Design a binder for these strands. Structure first.
Lengths: 258, 187, 142
RNA sequence: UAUCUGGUUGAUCCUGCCAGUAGUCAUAUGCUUGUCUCAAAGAUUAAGCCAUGCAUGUCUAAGUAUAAGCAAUUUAUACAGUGAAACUGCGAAUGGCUCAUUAAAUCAGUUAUCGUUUAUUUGAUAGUUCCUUUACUACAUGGUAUAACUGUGGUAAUUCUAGAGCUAAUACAUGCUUAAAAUCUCGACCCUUUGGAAGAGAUGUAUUUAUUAGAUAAAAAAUCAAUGUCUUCGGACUCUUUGAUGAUUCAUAAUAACUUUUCGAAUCGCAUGGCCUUGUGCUGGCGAUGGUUCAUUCAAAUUUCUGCCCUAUCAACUUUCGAUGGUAGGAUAGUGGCCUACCAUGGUUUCAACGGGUAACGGGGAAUAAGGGUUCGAUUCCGGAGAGGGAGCCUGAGAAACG
RNA sequence: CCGGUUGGCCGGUCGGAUUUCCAACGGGGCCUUUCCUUCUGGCUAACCUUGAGCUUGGCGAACCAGGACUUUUACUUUGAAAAAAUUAGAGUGUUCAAAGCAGGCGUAUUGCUCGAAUAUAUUAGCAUGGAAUAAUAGAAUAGGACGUUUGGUUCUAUUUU
RNA sequence: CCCGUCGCUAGUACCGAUUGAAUGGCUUAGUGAGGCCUCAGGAUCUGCUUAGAGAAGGGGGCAACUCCAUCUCAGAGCGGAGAAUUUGGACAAACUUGGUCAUUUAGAGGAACUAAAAGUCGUAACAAGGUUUCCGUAGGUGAACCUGCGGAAGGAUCAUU
RNA sequence: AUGAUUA
RNA sequence: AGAUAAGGGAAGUCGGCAAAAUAGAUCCGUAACUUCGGGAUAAGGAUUGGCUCUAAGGGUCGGGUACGAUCAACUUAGAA
RNA sequence: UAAGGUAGCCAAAUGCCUCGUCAUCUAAUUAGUGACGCGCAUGAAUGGAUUAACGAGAUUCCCACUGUCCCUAUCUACUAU
């Protein structure tokens, strides 16, 4: 439409932000950033509709502008910045550190953690190439662009980063039998320990994935996110850890605590 | 303006599409260049995304490569003598890509003399050693040697001067040289 | 496919400079590439004297995307043919199908010799012309 | 909640229609109308015409301020507080309105960009710019307006404008400032002839062209053109280096040149700190602005497969003067008859092409029902189109823009 | 033969849950002329490998990278995917209801906490287990498959010399 | 019970001289604005290079004579930006003229159809309807209709070993 | 040969 | 006997009588009606010079048991 | 009455009255055309009704064109003199 869009109505904003269909006919458009529009949680909806730390967008803008807030160790004083997947946010006041991960019900969770657990994160490599002057480099899922990594690091691997620089603390390779996390689709929030995969040369490599109740499924290799080895996650995980129990067990569950 | 789309053409079955939209800016075209020789004129044009586009006109000199030697020198241009697309470009002397032209041959000759020390047409220890080592490769073939006798050498333009502002190309050798001299001599 | 230099211009593979100075085996050079997706670049394309820059193997037209199969019905064009894509469109109300066809045109190299009725599979490449998007990669007759 | 009824006969059974019945985010109207909550609303005929008035402008600590604007510095002699107008920089291409056009066209799901542009964001990223490069030249930094304003003014009227005098910049036009090594060329000279060489020019990025590398299923022998490592010149010979892709002339590197020469900070705010060779010497922080390249993101444009109402009282359509392909070129941001030159005569069709009509924008959906389904969908969301009908074009990353 | 679902004596818990079980149901595997792709590799696997009953050495997919022949579909199962709103539907006293996605619980001064499911989604496109049904080509004037063989033609090609 | 002509009233559509009329779309040809692109144009402003003199000023042979700045004016080139105007091209609005396609519409008159409480002329059909009806084809006549040739039973016969 | 309308 | 006339255009006249206009060639386009053969040069429009070029169209002699040499016509198309 | 003009056609080159009546063409039309028909006196090989093509045939209108005309003027050759 004659140029880029700038506005966003409600009901075109995604579902998993859980924004209400009343309260004004406009929605927060994620300004461009290190994550996409849809698989991203803006800081306005974060502070205003996950924590209730503010009540009005002016107040959230007040907080972000007076710099009580900081994501990835930087203030980031824009009201509609995409706080995407896996990312870290640090609040000096209350000394909290939120981590942005998924839950099995298909929503952006709120993962409370400490300052040292904030100082490292995880990032799936999105691709690898050779930059100018013969400098091999890679680029992750959070717009982070990193130079001179290990030659062992190839595509679909994961890296653990220092957050004071963009350099690497260490890496994790891709192979059969590694703990993962899913990000995209019906499987949003699962945690499922690779059993095998399949190639289909020409497009759409698929991966067989199962969580610890033996329960399996299949997902696209660009929707998965590998988090380490079986047993230990490399980070802390939210309540449930990606299981997707039945509807009836959860009804009975709620009827047990009431 | 000149469009570049297919909403003004017919479909493949034979149906005049209807007029549905107005012409756009992301479907435009522009006039040809009709690039000539002498008194270098390079207008630049603003394009989609800034990204300037030096529309050559009247271009007098250009770059030319000799690929068996890998060298590349600046040279004048006598004129075009063959163009596969149109003899009109040949006659009217308009430089484009794939264009068979004649060049001065003086930098290649003098470079050959300075590099190998071997005469055409018709002392120090270091230069003598250099030429003695580089021998057994001054034996290219008859057609290029004859053209160096004449002082007018056949080159193929491989640039797109209306898109780049550079008439650049390479000398013909061997097979396509023979092909183009056959095409030229057809009478 | 009788004569490689049929056209007025000089047909060749761009950038493939056969250097007269070096004297190596196989006097004239020819680039090629395996198209991918489990296809094979035939020995007729390797040994070929032709050029055909619009060919997927020796040329420059990457195959990527959809893949289709059909039977050839036209050959009356120059390095281009037309096939017929017989399929069955379903009607829920009447709960049963009906034959339909789509005559996709495709491009063909001299590397293949195709007569009518020869079932063939092809590949999505970039727009070769107003009508064409596909290029033939395997034939299934003789 | 899978329902029937009245009417042809003197009467009977049937076919068959009429009428009844129930509903509608289906409209109009009538008669009546006390309350809470929620809420459509000049679409249908005229995408017919419009008075008047609004609907997009915008600053910080931080681009430019002697407002001959306003408070008071008294921490400030250049201002350094606040601050209209104006230059500059962004945005004005989003939103909002309508549904006239349009029947493989838009559109919906689904592919590709190994075929392209992309402001802004987000992550990285310019020791190499003095070209007889030693006086050729300020680098504790260089040149020019011009607005606003002063006053002279001109038209009946206009968001009309001229003449004369200033002055500003992140506005224009220019412009140097930090190592060390390493290869090519020449090449003085010794001349050696196993051949060694002083001294001199280049190398960053970007554009354009050409070339080379960009790889690698397995193990031993005979030699040479000249030993190549070090020598018992019996030959031990290992050591050797290139990433991704389903797949590339991919990323990327290096040779040889092109360029009228791109970028490589003459910008701005706070706090003002340390070494002493005790100085306007040298270093030093947190930021804002902009900038060449790459990736990312918001996009954009083309694009694969499938699907659209009624019509044969529309059966052949397309190609003059592009229709189908090929070659070459121009143009494009890019592929491509998108356009041109030449050549081959192709391409679509009863599996409904092509032509006509449409009270046709499409879809997600809405009414109605046991099931199957029929009808509607301008209308809140997604994608299109348009600004009275058409055509053209400037600015910009992005318009064929109509505030 | 194996193991999963359904119940079933004994209830060995005071309407939940257990063993050998009489029974059914589909699943996984071996053999009966039933190769239902194997070469390089490393796991050598189930290891004939056995040290006294917790030991050194069986046939590579049961883990993988690559080659390879992979004759075709229609159908059907399962999954990925179908933007929200809408429809059906979980929970919720809008005081009921249309609605909406909220709310609830404290020592009510520090505060704590479950939600915002799930389903449908025509055709078409992708992977997927099946092999009934419908066609579909294969070997007949044999240019027919395995061939350790034995030649000749051909090019490619690593290790050394 | 029922048929048709003819007569009166009203409606609906058709044919029809009028090279009918208007409205809209597509369009050959001719003229062709306007921007854009290319060949020039050159008002105008502006930087550099000398360029000699009307003659002040000072410094030096202090006597003629010399050095440079100055208000002044030609004259010459070396350039930068540069509008009006201009050639050619592609985009192509609009007008004129024809053609064609559709949508309504006028019309002397001609020939139909339908509706009308009680019009005229007959009596064709329903009984063997008083010449059995009907089907096709052809001719005839005020009108129904009659007649010829073949056909049917929906006939007035299921029937003559 | 024909027996007007309505019941 | 031959010609030309501004503006108008058959108003002249029994009547467009006389005169004008049209005119070759190439390309485009072509109605009703019809005995299906025609109407048809229907109607109606465009182009045409000079010069310099370019493209196609041929004849005959030549090959161990694809191509060359040589000779001469105007036909048509296209561009500056 | 021998039998009473059938089909068809028309103010037609046949229609007196007659410049028939209606429509159209026109500003105006005894003209042209299309219709009506008790047709003085239409009519079937004394051939009726059409009819493409053809015509130095008769008639009407329209486009172009023009000294035919408004309204005449000028020029040339041959005469006249």
């Amino acid at each position: 439409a004659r140029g880029p869009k700038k506005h966003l109505k409600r009901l075109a904003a995604p579902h998993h932000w859980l924004l209400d269909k009343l309260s004004g006919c406009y929605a927060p458009r994620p300004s461009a950033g290190p994550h996409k529009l849809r698989e991203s949680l803006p800081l306005i909806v974060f502070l205003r509709n996950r924590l209730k730390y503010a009540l009005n967008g002016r107040e959230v803008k007040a907080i972000l502008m007076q710099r009580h807030v900081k994501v990835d160790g930087k203030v980031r004083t824009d009201t509609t910045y995409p706080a995407g997947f896996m990312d870290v946010i640090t609040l000096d006041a209350t000394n909290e550190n939120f981590r942005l991960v998924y839950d099995v019900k298909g929503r952006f969770a709120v993962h409370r953690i400490t300052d040292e657990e904030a100082s490292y994160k995880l990032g799936k490599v999105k691709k690898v190439q050779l930059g100018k002057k013969g400098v091999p480099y890679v680029v992750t899922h959070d717009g982070r662009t990193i130079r001179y990594p290990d030659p062992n690091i190839k595509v679909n691997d994961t890296v653990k980063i220092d957050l004071a620089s963009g350099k690497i603390t260490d890496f994790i390779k891709f192979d059969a039998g590694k703990l993962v996390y899913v990000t995209g689709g019906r499987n949003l929030g699962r945690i499922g320990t690779i059993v095998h995969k399949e190639r289909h040369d020409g497009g759409f490599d698929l991966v067989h994935i199962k969580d610890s109740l033996d329960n399996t499924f299949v997902t696209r290799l660009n929707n998965v996110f590998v988090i380490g080895e079986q047993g230990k996650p490399y980070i802390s995980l939210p309540k449930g850890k990606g299981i997707k129990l039945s509807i009836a067990e959860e009804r009975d569950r709620r009827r047990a605590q009431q | 303006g000149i469009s570049r789309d297919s909403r003004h053409k017919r479909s493949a079955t034979g149906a005049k599409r209807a007029q549905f939209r107005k012409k756009r800016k992301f479907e435009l075209g522009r006039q040809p260049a009709n690039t000539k020789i002498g008194a270098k004129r390079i207008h630049s044009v603003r394009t989609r995304g800034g990204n300037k586009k030096y529309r050559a006109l009247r271009i007098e000199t250009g770059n030319f490569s000799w690929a068996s030697e890998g060298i590349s020198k600046k040279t004048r241009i006598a004129g075009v003598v063959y163009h596969p697309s149109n003899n009109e470009l040949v006659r009217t002397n308009t430089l484009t890509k794939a264009a068979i032209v004649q060049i001065d041959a003086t930098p290649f000759r003098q470079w050959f003399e300075a590099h190998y020390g071997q005469t055409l047409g018709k002392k120090s220890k270091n230069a003598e050693r250099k030429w003695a080592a580089r021998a057994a490769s001054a034996k290219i073939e008859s057609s290029v040697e004859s053209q160096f006798s004449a002082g007018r050498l056949y080159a193929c333009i491989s640039s797109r001067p209306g898109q780049s502002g550079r008439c650049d190309g390479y000398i013909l050798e061997g097979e396509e040289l023979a092909f183009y001299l056959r095409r030229l001599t057809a009478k | 496919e009788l004569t490689v230099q049929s056209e007025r211009a000089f047909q060749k593979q761009p950038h493939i400079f056969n250097n007269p100075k070096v004297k190596t085996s196989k006097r004239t050079k020819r680039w090629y590439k395996n198209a991918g997706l489990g296809f094979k670049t035939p020995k007729t394309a390797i040994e070929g004297s032709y050029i055909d820059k619009k060919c997927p193997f020796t040329g420059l037209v990457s195959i990527r995307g959809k893949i289709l199969t059909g039977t050839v019905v036209s050959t009356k064009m120059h390095r281009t043919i037309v096939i017929r894509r017989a399929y069955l469109h379903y009607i829920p109300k009447y709960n049963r199908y009906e034959k339909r066809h789509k005559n996709v045109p495709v491009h063909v190299s001299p590397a293949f010799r195709v007569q009518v009725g020869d079932i063939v599979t092809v590949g999505q490449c970039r727009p070769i012309s107003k009508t064409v998007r596909f290029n033939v990669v395997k034939v299934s007759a003789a």
